[PDB]
mmCIF file of all heavy atoms in Angstrom:
data_model
loop_
_atom_site.group_PDB
_atom_site.id
_atom_site.type_symbol
_atom_site.label_atom_id
_atom_site.label_comp_id
_atom_site.label_asym_id
_atom_site.label_seq_id
_atom_site.Cartn_x
_atom_site.Cartn_y
_atom_site.Cartn_z
ATOM 1 N N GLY B 86 -12.720 -86.748 121.506
ATOM 2 C CA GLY B 86 -13.525 -86.925 122.645
ATOM 3 C C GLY B 86 -14.469 -85.851 122.900
ATOM 4 O O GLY B 86 -15.317 -85.932 123.697
ATOM 5 N N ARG B 87 -14.334 -84.868 121.929
ATOM 6 C CA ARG B 87 -15.380 -83.765 121.888
ATOM 7 C C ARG B 87 -15.212 -83.098 120.640
ATOM 8 O O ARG B 87 -14.178 -83.397 119.805
ATOM 9 C CB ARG B 87 -15.132 -82.705 123.002
ATOM 10 C CG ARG B 87 -13.712 -81.947 123.015
ATOM 11 C CD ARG B 87 -13.777 -80.729 123.685
ATOM 12 N NE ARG B 87 -12.551 -79.934 123.841
ATOM 13 C CZ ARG B 87 -12.323 -78.842 123.036
ATOM 14 N NH1 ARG B 87 -13.213 -78.353 122.141
ATOM 15 N NH2 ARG B 87 -11.116 -78.302 123.172
ATOM 16 N N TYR B 88 -16.094 -82.049 120.300
ATOM 17 C CA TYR B 88 -16.057 -81.396 119.029
ATOM 18 C C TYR B 88 -15.461 -80.041 119.369
ATOM 19 O O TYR B 88 -15.309 -79.561 120.451
ATOM 20 C CB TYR B 88 -17.506 -81.169 118.547
ATOM 21 C CG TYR B 88 -17.928 -82.463 117.957
ATOM 22 C CD1 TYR B 88 -19.009 -83.111 118.635
ATOM 23 C CD2 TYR B 88 -17.564 -83.059 116.623
ATOM 24 C CE1 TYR B 88 -19.601 -84.308 118.253
ATOM 25 C CE2 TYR B 88 -18.102 -84.257 116.199
ATOM 26 C CZ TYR B 88 -19.084 -84.811 116.986
ATOM 27 O OH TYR B 88 -19.708 -86.108 116.545
ATOM 28 N N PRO B 89 -14.694 -79.512 118.240
ATOM 29 C CA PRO B 89 -14.025 -78.155 118.370
ATOM 30 C C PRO B 89 -15.085 -77.070 118.267
ATOM 31 O O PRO B 89 -16.170 -77.062 117.578
ATOM 32 C CB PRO B 89 -13.116 -78.167 117.149
ATOM 33 C CG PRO B 89 -13.777 -79.183 116.122
ATOM 34 C CD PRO B 89 -14.465 -80.183 116.922
ATOM 35 N N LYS B 90 -14.818 -76.005 118.980
ATOM 36 C CA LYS B 90 -15.488 -74.674 118.878
ATOM 37 C C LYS B 90 -15.064 -74.042 117.543
ATOM 38 O O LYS B 90 -14.103 -74.348 116.905
ATOM 39 C CB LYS B 90 -15.240 -73.818 120.064
ATOM 40 C CG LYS B 90 -15.546 -74.325 121.446
ATOM 41 C CD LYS B 90 -17.025 -74.541 121.510
ATOM 42 C CE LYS B 90 -17.384 -75.102 123.077
ATOM 43 N NZ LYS B 90 -18.589 -74.252 123.410
ATOM 44 N N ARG B 91 -15.790 -73.072 117.087
ATOM 45 C CA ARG B 91 -15.519 -72.247 115.936
ATOM 46 C C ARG B 91 -14.206 -71.598 116.073
ATOM 47 O O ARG B 91 -13.428 -71.588 115.083
ATOM 48 C CB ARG B 91 -16.690 -71.201 115.714
ATOM 49 C CG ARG B 91 -16.621 -70.602 114.373
ATOM 50 C CD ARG B 91 -17.788 -69.670 114.297
ATOM 51 N NE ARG B 91 -18.726 -69.730 113.228
ATOM 52 C CZ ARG B 91 -19.863 -70.419 113.150
ATOM 53 N NH1 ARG B 91 -20.268 -71.027 114.339
ATOM 54 N NH2 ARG B 91 -20.522 -70.399 112.082
ATOM 55 N N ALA B 92 -13.923 -71.134 117.188
ATOM 56 C CA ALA B 92 -12.581 -70.491 117.323
ATOM 57 C C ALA B 92 -11.296 -71.414 117.208
ATOM 58 O O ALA B 92 -10.199 -71.088 116.852
ATOM 59 C CB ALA B 92 -12.441 -69.622 118.640
ATOM 60 N N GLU B 93 -11.629 -72.689 117.584
ATOM 61 C CA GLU B 93 -10.587 -73.803 117.371
ATOM 62 C C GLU B 93 -10.421 -74.088 115.975
ATOM 63 O O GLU B 93 -9.298 -74.287 115.533
ATOM 64 C CB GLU B 93 -11.099 -74.963 118.222
ATOM 65 C CG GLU B 93 -10.908 -74.635 119.639
ATOM 66 C CD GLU B 93 -11.333 -75.851 120.576
ATOM 67 O OE1 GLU B 93 -12.489 -76.395 120.608
ATOM 68 O OE2 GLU B 93 -10.489 -76.306 121.336
ATOM 69 N N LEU B 94 -11.480 -74.278 115.247
ATOM 70 C CA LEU B 94 -11.500 -74.549 113.827
ATOM 71 C C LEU B 94 -10.888 -73.256 113.106
ATOM 72 O O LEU B 94 -9.996 -73.548 112.164
ATOM 73 C CB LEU B 94 -12.939 -74.728 113.351
ATOM 74 C CG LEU B 94 -13.624 -75.876 113.927
ATOM 75 C CD1 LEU B 94 -15.167 -75.742 113.656
ATOM 76 C CD2 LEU B 94 -13.283 -77.140 113.046
ATOM 77 N N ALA B 95 -11.228 -72.125 113.538
ATOM 78 C CA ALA B 95 -10.424 -70.943 112.994
ATOM 79 C C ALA B 95 -9.045 -70.995 113.077
ATOM 80 O O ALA B 95 -8.291 -70.565 112.066
ATOM 81 C CB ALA B 95 -11.055 -69.690 113.471
ATOM 82 N N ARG B 96 -8.559 -71.302 114.268
ATOM 83 C CA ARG B 96 -7.048 -71.539 114.364
ATOM 84 C C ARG B 96 -6.439 -72.713 113.475
ATOM 85 O O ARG B 96 -5.433 -72.703 113.018
ATOM 86 C CB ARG B 96 -6.764 -71.740 115.929
ATOM 87 C CG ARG B 96 -5.296 -72.187 116.218
ATOM 88 C CD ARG B 96 -5.282 -72.655 117.801
ATOM 89 N NE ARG B 96 -5.279 -74.068 117.848
ATOM 90 C CZ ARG B 96 -6.247 -74.793 118.586
ATOM 91 N NH1 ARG B 96 -7.190 -74.046 119.153
ATOM 92 N NH2 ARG B 96 -6.430 -76.126 118.630
ATOM 93 N N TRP B 97 -7.274 -73.792 113.287
ATOM 94 C CA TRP B 97 -6.777 -74.941 112.619
ATOM 95 C C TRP B 97 -6.544 -74.661 111.142
ATOM 96 O O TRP B 97 -5.492 -75.027 110.545
ATOM 97 C CB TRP B 97 -7.544 -76.155 112.778
ATOM 98 C CG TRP B 97 -7.612 -76.781 114.019
ATOM 99 C CD1 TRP B 97 -6.650 -76.609 115.021
ATOM 100 C CD2 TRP B 97 -8.560 -77.788 114.558
ATOM 101 N NE1 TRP B 97 -6.899 -77.354 116.149
ATOM 102 C CE2 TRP B 97 -8.161 -78.111 115.836
ATOM 103 C CE3 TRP B 97 -9.743 -78.378 114.009
ATOM 104 C CZ2 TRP B 97 -8.769 -79.104 116.660
ATOM 105 C CZ3 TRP B 97 -10.380 -79.250 114.757
ATOM 106 C CH2 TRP B 97 -10.010 -79.505 116.164
#
Side-chain angles (χ1 to χ4, degrees):
Chain B
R87 63 162 178 100
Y88 291 105
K90 301 298 183 132
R91 196 184 227 96
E93 289 182 299
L94 291 169
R96 174 197 90 238
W97 284 345

